[PDB]
Amino acid sequence: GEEQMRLPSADVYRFAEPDSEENIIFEGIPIIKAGTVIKLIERLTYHMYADPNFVRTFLTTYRSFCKPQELLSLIIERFEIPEPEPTEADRIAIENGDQPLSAELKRFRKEYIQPVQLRVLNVCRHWVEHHFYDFERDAYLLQRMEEFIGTVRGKAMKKWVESITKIIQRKKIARDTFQSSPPTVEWHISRPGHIETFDLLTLHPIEIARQLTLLESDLYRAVQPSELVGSVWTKEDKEINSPNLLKMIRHTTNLTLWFEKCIVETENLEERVAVVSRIIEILQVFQELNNFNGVLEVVSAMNSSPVYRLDHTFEQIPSRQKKILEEAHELSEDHYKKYLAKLRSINPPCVPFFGIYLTNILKTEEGNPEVLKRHGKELINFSKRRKVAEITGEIQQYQNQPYCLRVESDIKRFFENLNPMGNSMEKEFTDYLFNKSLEIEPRNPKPLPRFPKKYSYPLKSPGVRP
Ligand SMILES: COc1cc2nc(C)nc(N[C@H](C)c3cccc(C(F)(F)F)c3)c2cc1OC
């Protein structure tokens, strides 16, 4: 019909092929369910309207179906739209040295070329503003973007080229607060600066949780939604695609295993009761700070194979501390029903529990197909990417919640450099912790032997009241 004749031919432009059941599926603006990468780029830079939601979702999730170099090539190809040939009358006009009417050419420029070219520049602007890490990880991608942006000519393009350049430079420079004062830093046995004596029972339980909450808050806030899409932290190139997420996972593994190591490596029953009691006090302070990540690291350590089975140790734990620890576990029951009600009812600041997002993203990634097939053609399942993007959107709503707590660099460095496993692998280390648990509290028919004390200093806790 007339509509497709106005548009460029498929032999000169790939983004003008009409929609059909084998290139795009839908669920004022229609929501895209699936499509070829060409149809996704086309609707990303559609001429009829802007789509901020689809631009946001696409730039968070595109790396799961398209490489950054390929996306740049596609939006440049999209921008280079062929203009129609002059009509027969205008060909005669031009050949006579006269100005053509160019009515359709001007219409196509105003109603199609200009909107698409401005929509391509808007993708470029959102790309550098919210995903500049793609350009830091690939210097050549930035050379190509700056060459493209630097050669764009036009009246309406001028403002866009300058705002994209302002964002690029502002991001390059970024490479190189409190309304009230924070509480007084707490000390217990270990003195400020005597890092050689820093340990679970020597540092104040309040300050251990405060400094871990700052460290975990910082770790939580550095994770970018794209580190979670396509399960890329589980794939082979995980170290480049998911550096902040892997730091968050390694911290949680190291802290949880450190709590287990402190517990099972304390062979004396009375001393081990004090260690467990101190970790529950650390959890109580994580509850006061709304650090749900920390609360569930402690629950994870208490529910581990080596610790959960220590019946003689939990027998001596006061009922008040037992009920605190049992309620913290109930945050995880019924698919984290209680955790989610708590998270939505608290006031900021908080550190949400990170593991539940990883779990739900893996369930979405494993339970939805990468493509949808229609008439023998493969279409990228975009609604799969949108569901993962919605979950990572839940992460973001809590990434602007700084804590009014003073950093203590020595305690911060102690928790950053925790290495409970040492040179052992995780599986072999957890086998060791469980074999140590059987040593300190043997199975029922075998009796309970006594063990010598290892702590010279006192075991009494200073408490959780500041
Ligand atoms: C069905 O499996 C479980 C049910 C649980 N139910 C509750 C109420 N809490 C649990 N765990 C908490 C963190 C806990 C851990 C150690 C010791 C105590 C204390 F002795 F203090 F009570 C409490 C549970 C753990 C489970 O499996 C590992």
Q: Running DSSP on this structure, what letter comes out for residue 373?
A: E
Helix H or strand E segment including 371: strand 371-374
CA distance 389 to 226: 8
Most ligand 1 atoms within 8 A of CB, residue of 280, 281, 299, 325 to mutate: 325
Q: Are 364 and 231 in contact (CB under 8 A)?
A: no
Q: Which are the contacts of 407, defined by CB distance < 8 A and separation ≥ 6? A: 211, 214
CA distance 343 to 340: 5
Q: Which are the contacts of 466, defined by CB distance < 8 A and separation ≥ 6? A: 183, 184, 186, 206
Q: Which are the contacts of 3, defined by CB distance < 8 A and separation ≥ 6? A: none
Q: Are 244 and 437 in contact (CB under 8 A)?
A: no
Kindly report the length of the chain. 466
The protein residue whose alpha carbon is closest to atom 19 in ligand 1 is: 322
- Does a cis peptide bond (omega within 30 degrees of 0) precede residue 306? no
The owner of tokens 């919210």 is 130
Q: Are 81 and 112 in contact (CB under 8 A)?
A: yes
Number of H helices, E strands in the chain: 23, 4
The response to whether residue 302 sits with its C-beta less than 6 Å from ligand 1 reads: yes
Experimental method: X-ray
CA distance 257 to 213: 17
The owner of tokens 């794209």 is 226
- Helix ranges (DSSP H) in 28-156: 37-44, 52-61, 68-79, 88-95, 103-108, 114-130, 133-137, 139-150
The response to whether residue 137 sits with its C-beta less than 6 Å from ligand 1 reads: no
Structure tokens at 408: 């203590």
- Cα dihedral across residues 258, 263, 268, 270: positive or negative: positive
Instruction: Output Rg (C-alpha) for the chain, integer angstroms.
Output: 30
Find the distance separating the first CA and the last CA of the chain, reported in whole Å: 77
Alpha carbon 267 to its chain's center: 39
Parse the chain into domains and list their residue ranges.
2-172+355-397, 183-354+398-466
Nearest to 437 by CA among 337, 329, 304: 304
The SS3 assignment for 381 reads strand
309 φ/ψ angles, rounded to the nearest 5 degrees = -75, -5
Most ligand 1 atoms within 8 A of CB, residue of 281, 308, 317 to mutate: 308
The response to whether residue 326 sits with its C-beta less than 6 Å from ligand 1 reads: yes
CA distance 265 to 41: 57
Q: Resolution for this model in angstroms, one decimal place?
A: 2.3
The SS3 assignment for 378 reads strand
The response to whether residue 308 sits with its C-beta less than 6 Å from ligand 1 reads: yes
- Can you spell out the DSSP letters for 24-60? EEE--PPPEEEE-HHHHHHHHT-SS---HHHHHHHHH
Beta-bridged to residue 462, according to DSSP, are none
